[PDB]
Amino acid sequence: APFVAPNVQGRVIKESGYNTKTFKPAYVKPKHVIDPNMIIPRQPGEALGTG
Amino acid sequence: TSLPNYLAGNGDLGSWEPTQIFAGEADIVTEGGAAGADIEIYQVIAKNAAGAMVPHDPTATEVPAPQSVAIGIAAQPAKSGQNVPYYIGGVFNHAALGWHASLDTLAKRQAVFDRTNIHIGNLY
Numbered sequence: 321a322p323f324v325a326p327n328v329q330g331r332v333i334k335e336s337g338y339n340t341k342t343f344k345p346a347y348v349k350p351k352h353v354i355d356p357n358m359i360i361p362r363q364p365g366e367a368l369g370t371g
Numbered sequence: 372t373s374l375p376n377y378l379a380g381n382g383d384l385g386s387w388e389p390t391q392i393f394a395g396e397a398d399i400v401t402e403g404g405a406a407g408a409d410i411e412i413y414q415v416i417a418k419n420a421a422g423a424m425v426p427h428d429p430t431a432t433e434v435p436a437p438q439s440v441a442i443g444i445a446a447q448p449a450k451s452g453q454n455v456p457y458y459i460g461g462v463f464n465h466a467a468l469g470w471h472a473s474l475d476t477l478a479k480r481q482a483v484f485d486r487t488n489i490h491i492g493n494l495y
Contacts, residue, residue: 325447328401328456 394492395462403456406449414445414469415483416457424455427471427483441483444468460488 322331362371392413393399407423410416415427417438424445428438443457465480468491474480481491 325456327446328403328458329399331403 392467394464397462398460400460406455410445412448462490465491
């Protein structure tokens with residue numbers, strides 16, 4: 321605080337102002353197409369011959 | 372500091388009489404600023420060319436120098452380089468204030484503050 325001789329009126333103190341921020345999210349779209357080409361082939365667990 | 376005094380003597384302690392500063396009810400405005408010279412309480416003070424408070428000095432020179440136009444009444448004493456608080460507005464007893472030489476009569480002591488918020492006048 322300011323030292324002010326008791327005679328005189330005193331000093332005028334100031335203030336400060338705030339701020340803001342703003343954000344939009346991004347958008348994500350993975351997709352798969354499932355051919356027969358991908359359903360048919362043998363998957364590892366399957367036995368040999370008669371999968 | 373050490374010896375008492377044994378001789379008889381008179382108790383002439385001291386004296387005091389008020390310094391009444393105000394002679395009116397205008398607005399009492401005050402500022403503060405650096406001083407360019409030694410300044411006493413309630414001295415009338417101008418601002419030198421460098422913008423530092425200086426005791427008022429009429430006829431300070433072929434052109435009036437800025438010490439020559441009074442700007443306020445020092446509210447507390449200060450040495451050079453120090454900050455002086457000082458009045459800029461109000462109605463002030465001309466007798467309480469410190470004045471330059473040859474700025475003797477109240478007719479002059481008013482003319483020095485002929486427009487500002489400072490007015491200078493008698494007490495009754």
